[PDB]
């Protein structure tokens, strides 16, 4: 995963 991902609470 080159691009960052995360839990859905990070972005709207």
């Amino acid at each position, epitope marked *: *995963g080159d691009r960052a*991902a995360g*839990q*859905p*609470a990070g972005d709207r």
Partner: antibody
Amino acid sequence: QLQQSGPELVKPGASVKISCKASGYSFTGYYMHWVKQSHVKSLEWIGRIDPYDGATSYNQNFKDKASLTVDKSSTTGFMELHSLTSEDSAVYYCAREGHWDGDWYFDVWGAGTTVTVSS
Amino acid sequence: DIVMTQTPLSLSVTIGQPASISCKSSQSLLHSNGKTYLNWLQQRPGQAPKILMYLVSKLDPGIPDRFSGSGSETDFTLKISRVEAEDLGVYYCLQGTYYPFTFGSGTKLEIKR
């Protein structure tokens, strides 16, 4: 893997800028979040920033208070706080949203920066 | 934002005895993709927070097996099989389903010796 700046004393109304030095991993590959700790029971999420392009997602409470910038050259993330009041005195952590077992969580935390707002 | 309630507020457990921490959310933390983004943190005094579990039950590889987590959509429980001395500190739950992130009140754990 995360180094933060030293404690700061700020006068009410002034601004402060604290840094989060990253090392040992792909800097542009993980979000970097910031957390405010007012006291032992108060833990609040400030926002996150994508180090690849500088995309910042903030919490609505910290829209006019905090602003997240990044420096890919030094692989360092910064948080600036504007127009500080007494309620801004807290400890500020930076954390990395890492990857493991196909899931994301905060696996690396900075030591924390103590910010005291006083005249 | 989602409100997290942790019970009890303080807890005192003897070494080798089980412990149990509860965390309740205002809304169901189940997301559209079917994952329940609940995280458990531990902050020893004088240190930064550290995530113990993610997605209710998945442990961090550095965390021993005596920590376990079991919860439904709204109610969650963090269990310690045999409490050891290093397990002191304040424990927070953290939801990651709905923006923004919100932490719990925290549960202070004292080691009884």
